Design a binder for this molecule. Structure first.
Ligand SMILES: CCCCCCCC/C=C/CCCCCCCC(=O)O[C@H](COC(=O)CCCCCCCCCCCCCCC)COP(=O)(O)OC[C@H](N)C(=O)O
Ligand SMILES: CCCCCCCC/C=C\CCCCCCCC(=O)O[C@H](COC(=O)CCCCCCCCCCCCCCC)COP(=O)(O)OC[C@H](N)C(=O)O
Ligand SMILES: CC(C)CCC[C@@H](C)[C@H]1CC[C@H]2[C@@H]3CC=C4C[C@@H](OC(=O)CCC(=O)O)CC[C@]4(C)[C@H]3CC[C@]12C
Ligand SMILES: CC(C)CCC[C@@H](C)[C@H]1CC[C@H]2[C@@H]3CC=C4C[C@@H](OC(=O)CCC(=O)O)CC[C@]4(C)[C@H]3CC[C@]12C
Ligand SMILES: CC(C)CCC[C@@H](C)[C@H]1CC[C@H]2[C@@H]3CC=C4C[C@@H](OC(=O)CCC(=O)O)CC[C@]4(C)[C@H]3CC[C@]12C
Length: 927
């Protein structure tokens, strides 16, 4: 007799190391390598007007959903549309009220700044009208039908909206303005998936949507694979986007005038891996980009799932970008696609990305410099301009630096960096940088890169108190080949009183300023990297480590002091960590120590298609005072504990199905021991025996399968075919031996607790004092979602397990120990399909509040086995070798299938365990 409670020293240590690593991964993911939170709360006056003219006549889903139009209180006094239509699709468990901050800032900007502008009104800027959908806090990620129903409802609403702009009592707008044929769709979370689904739906108007701006939307892969329909919808929307853009002829492309910008909140986003927000595999760079929120200028901060919609810093950047893509003189109320893309690139991207277009070199001359005929400001070639303060000469004066000749073999770059705002043409301010050919001068202001302000008192690139926001530094950068036509670069001081300021401008050879360190990941993970930048270094220097591409490894960056002899630094050192492929850039103001966590190659997303030739891996860009005549040292080491929590977000769904592979192997061992020796061993005796051979060999075979134009290559197993991460198979295997052991002990404790309560109550009433199985089966077969029928079965198998345990304690017979063991093993298998089947219960219950074959074949095999155990029968021991073989093969196939296809096709695991349960029913029927 072995108590069901006993554990072997080998299986306890293996189980505790697994529970110990799951507590380390979770802790190091909540505490280590965490980004700073610079999000500032947004304050607004909210009002929503229900558009109830839309009804069951326009869609049968109108009884279920509603459409509301945001009206900011004090700026909006009628439910009348005067501007361009914008729809916010809320995400999973999201409200229509989450549109509160974005709509409010758009209302307050037109009221305070734009209505007064006559050029902006003339060119076609009108207010934006923000419509929002109440999806009754539906959970789209777990029910595929709900996502499709929402897309159909919104395609109708886009038709009903555009119809309110043709109506005089609900429209108040000018009459030369074409009637709107497009709505701008902003989707948070799964609302960016509902937005793309609409374009593939049968009820979609041809040119209804042109611009989709999604916040934290998982475009690459489904967050959860519990629902099959979600897995197929993604395969249809993802395929539609990739086949459309594959088309050579733009006429064939149905998505030519469409633009998708996928914004992501980065690390602080725990609900959706920001790696799944990447559109690189679906949209060409011409038609969209994925930008993290750390690269966005005027934000420079990672945001949590909800913070993306409620930040004050982010609410300002999206409303400014939208009011620069809108034209009421065009049917679709938007600028053409290539213009829409440049506006999104200037407002959301840094400017140092290589997709940006500098327009000022070839821009027409804007100024007439005649005060440079006198030869007083021209300076020596190779002479770097440094203006420690401005206007010490008491007059508007100039400092003119010659553009070197095009004969340069190396690449050479002009870089200017001034804290002071450069002036735009037609304005007067302290500084004006212009490329002047001899006389004709083009202001370079349109091309200014705003960098966070690194000053000795700065800790963060973002400030959560608006009063303390250090005005951003201006930066200019230009490859010489582009600026060669112009002869000089003139920094004109227009200041006339001594004033705080700094302009350091210099032309640097690319070699001297650019460094690449080629060290293997294995060498960098053992020795780190140290790089001394020489004292005679260009103001901007750029180290690139091509090896660091993974999102699973985190490093620490320690930059040396840069103490200056004599005078102090004009600015503190600024580091920009960045990746080319997913537009994730990070800025460390006044760098000393920095945590390098990057969103690079990611476990299960489509393969990165950039195949960039030289720009790959991680690069840090360092800006320091170049007049300090002192060297700086750069150190990059690996963070072992912080890198382990990087695993928690990427594999926070492999515990739905990988813990099933362990159960199948243990059950297989139990069944083969039973058939050979006639004793059905306990789940803990099955783990010790299985952990000695079958769990190790099957973990070695899954590693072998990994090492053995298709965008679904990374969907199986651990998601990566890189030989470096094969260690993830044992970490995912040993965390499961621990979770699959605890669950065994929890089930045993639950059985014991229920037994003692039934005893206590029997004591309570004793001293002081078949039909149900048939009814439940009838109810379970008839009229309920099969997922609830599975949950009641699991409750009837707990009843059999309690009635088996009590008989086993009272008799202590060999065969009564056989049944308690077998029922526990079957109940333990069933408890592991609940993770995949429990979510459809939540949707059914909450959608029934609003009054809203497969249903039989899927639960009957399990309804029969739970009933053939309420009769006390033990599986007949198992033509004999062939029968025991089928049992084994069927339980080994389940283990292998649950490891390979359980992250992407987890829903199928319910229908594989059904097959096994039917096999058990047939084996029961044999004897
Ligand atoms: C032995 C087998 C297992 C036992 C039975 C099964 C128990 C659990 C099974 C799993 C399936 C059901 C639960 C699914 C999780 C739902 C997550 C969720 O809805 O929540 C997000 C976000 O919440 C999270 O990130 C979850 C973190 C805690 C997870 C705890 C899970 C429990 C696991 C431990 C179980 C231990 C069991 C051992 C034995 C008992 C909120 O979306 P939100 O940000 O609001 O809206 C988006 C946004 N505003 C927008 O607008 O779009
Ligand atoms: C194999 C390698 C990869 C797999 C291993 C790990 C994958 C995960 C596997 C399974 C999922 C585990 C279920 C949920 C865990 C994660 C919860 C979590 O991280 O969600 C926090 C909340 O975290 C907590 O508050 C801790 C509680 C977690 C569970 C602790 C017990 C675990 C029980 C396990 C059983 C042990 C029993 C053994 C007995 C000895 C929400 O994001 P939060 O940080 O609060 O946001 C703050 C904000 N955004 C911010 O900016 O900082
Ligand atoms: C249910 C929750 C608390 C999950 C955590 C489970 C384990 C981490 C702990 C709690 C239950 C414990 C077990 C409960 C009962 C037993 C059997 C007990 O001895 C027996 O009754 C069997 C006879 C024998 O040991 O030879 C020895 C300790 C042990 C293995 C305990 C070892 C430590 C265990 C596995
Ligand atoms: C501990 C043992 C018994 C098993 C572990 C349970 C897992 C099945 C749970 C634990 C953590 C859960 C995850 C925690 C949070 C999320 C985010 C959330 O993602 C969504 O699909 C909705 C978010 C959105 O897209 O808006 C809900 C599913 C998911 C992946 C959960 C799926 C189910 C998981 C993997
Ligand atoms: C919410 C989670 C933690 C589940 C725990 C609650 C249920 C699973 C409980 C509620 C009622 C219980 C049932 C109430 C009565 C019985 C009869 C009992 O057997 C008898 O009829 C008496 C004979 C005997 O106990 O020896 C076996 C357990 C069972 C099915 C119980 C199994 C556990 C049940 C379903």
């Amino acid at each position: 007799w072995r108590s069901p409670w006993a554990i072997s020293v080998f299986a306890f240590v293996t189980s505790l190391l697994g529970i110990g690593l799951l507590l380390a991964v979770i802790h190091s993911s909540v505490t280590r390598q965490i980004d700073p939170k610079g999000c500032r709360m947004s304050y607004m006056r909210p009002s929503y007007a229900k558009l109830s003219d839309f009804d069951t006549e326009h869609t049968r889903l109108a009884s279920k959903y509603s459409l509301y139009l945001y009206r900011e209180q004090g700026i909006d006094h009628d439910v009348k549309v005067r501007g361009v239509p914008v729809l916010f699709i809320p995400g999973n468990a999201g409200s229509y009220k989450q549109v509160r901050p974005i709509a409010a800032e758009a209302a307050n900007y037109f009221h305070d700044v734009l209505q007064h502008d006559e050029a902006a009104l003339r060119a076609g800027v009108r207010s934006l009208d923000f419509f929002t959908v109440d999806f009754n806090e539906d959970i789209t990620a777990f029910h595929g039908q709900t996502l499709l129903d929402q897309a159909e409802y919104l395609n109708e609403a886009i038709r009903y909206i555009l119809s309110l702009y043709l109506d005089p009592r609900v429209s108040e707008r000018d009459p030369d303005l074409p009637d709107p044929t497009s709505v701008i769709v902003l989707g948070h979370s799964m609302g960016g998936i509902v937005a793309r689904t609409m374009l593939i739906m049968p009820n979609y108007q041809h040119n209804s949507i042109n611009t989709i701006i999604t916040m934290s939307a998982p475009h690459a892969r489904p967050p959860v694979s519990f629902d099959g329909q979600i897995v197929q919808t993604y395969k249809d929307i993802n395929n539609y986007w990739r086949h459309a853009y594959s088309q050579k002829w733009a006429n064939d492309n149905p998505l030519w005038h469409v633009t998708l910008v996928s914004i992501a909140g980065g690390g602080l986003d725990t609900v959706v891996p920001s790696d799944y927000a990447s559109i690189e595999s679906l949209v060409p760079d011409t038609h969209g980009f994925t930008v993290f929120t750390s690269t966005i200028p005027n934000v420079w901060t990672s945001m949590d799932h909800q913070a993306i919609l409620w930040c004050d810093q982010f609410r300002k950047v999206i409303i400014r970008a939208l009011f620069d893509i809108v034209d009421v003189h065009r049917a679709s109320q938007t600028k053409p696609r290539a213009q829409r893309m440049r506006v999104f690139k200037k407002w959301f991207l840094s400017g140092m990305e290589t997709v940006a277009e500098k327009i000022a070199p070839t821009s027409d001359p804007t100024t007439l410099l005649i005060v440079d005929d006198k030869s007083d400001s021209i300076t020596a070639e190779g002479e770097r301009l440094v203006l420690r303060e401005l206007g010490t000469q008491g007059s508007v004066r100039a400092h003119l630096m010659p553009i070197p000749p095009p004969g340069s073999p190396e690449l050479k770059r002009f870089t200017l960096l001034t804290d002071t705002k450069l002036d735009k043409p037609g304005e007067n301010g302290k500084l004006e940088v212009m490329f002047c050919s001899v006389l004709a001068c083009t202001n370079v202001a349109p091309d200014v890169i705003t960098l966070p302000a690194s000053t000795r008192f700065a800790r963060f690139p973002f400030s959560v108190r608006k009063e303390a926001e250090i005005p951003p530094f201006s930066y200019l950068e230009y490859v010489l080949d582009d600026i060669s036509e112009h002869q000089f670069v003139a920094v004109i001081e227009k200041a006339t009183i001594p004033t705080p300021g700094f302009v350091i401008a210099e032309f640097s050879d690319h070699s001297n300023s650019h460094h690449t360190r080629h060290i293997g990941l294995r060498n960098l993970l053992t020795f780190g990297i140290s790089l001394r930048l020489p004292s005679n270094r260009p103001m901007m220097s750029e180290v690139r480590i091509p090896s660091v591409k993974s999102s699973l490894l985190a490093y620490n960056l320690r930059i040396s002091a840069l103490e200056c002899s004599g005078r102090k630094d004009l600015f503190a050192p600024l580091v920009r960590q960045y990746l080319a492929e997913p537009y994730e850039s990070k800025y460390f103001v006044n760098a000393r120590q920095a945590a390098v966590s990057l969103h690079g190659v990611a476990p299960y997303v489509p393969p990165p298609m950039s195949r960039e030739p030289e720009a790959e891996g991680l690069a840090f860009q360092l800006w320091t005072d170049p007049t300090c005549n002192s060297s700086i040292q750069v150190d990059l080491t690996v963070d072992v504990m912080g890198s382990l929590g990087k695993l928690y977000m990427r594999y926070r769904t492999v515990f739905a199905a990988f813990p099933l592979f362990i159960v199948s192997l243990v059950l297989r061992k139990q069944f083969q021991v039973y058939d050979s020796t006639g004793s059905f061993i306990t789940f803990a005796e099955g783990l010790d025996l299985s952990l000695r051979q079958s769990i190790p060999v099957m973990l070695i075979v899954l590693a072998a399968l990994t090492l053995s134009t298709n965008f679904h290559q990374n969907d199986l197993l651990i998601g990566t075919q890189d030989p470096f991460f094969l260690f993830l198979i044992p970490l995912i295997g040993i965390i499961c031996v621990g979770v699959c052991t605890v669950v065994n002990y929890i089930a045993l404790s639950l059985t014991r607790l229920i037994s003692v309560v039934i005893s206590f109550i029997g004591f309570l009433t004793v001293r002081f004092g078949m039909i149900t199985t048939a009814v439940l089966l009838f109810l379970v077969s008839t009229m309920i979602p099969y997922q609830l029928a599975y949950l009641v079965a699991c409750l009837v198998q707990l009843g059999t397990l309690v009635r088996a345990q009590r008989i086993s304690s009272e008799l202590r017979s060999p065969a009564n120990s056989n049944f308690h063991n077998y029922v526990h093993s079957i109940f333990i298998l069933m408890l592991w399909i609940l993770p995949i089947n429990l979510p459809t219960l939540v949707v059914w219950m909450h959608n029934l509040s609003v009054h809203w074959h497969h249903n039989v074949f899927s639960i009957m095999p399990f309804i029969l086995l739970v009933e053939t155990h309420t009769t006390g029968q033990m599986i007949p021991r198992t033509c004999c070798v062939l029968l025991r073989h089928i049992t084994s093969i069927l339980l080994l196939s389940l283990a292998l299938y649950a490891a390979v296809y359980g992250v992407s096709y987890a829903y199928t695991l319910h229908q594989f365990v059904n097959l096994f349960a039917f096999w058990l029913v047939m084996v029961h029927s044999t004897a």
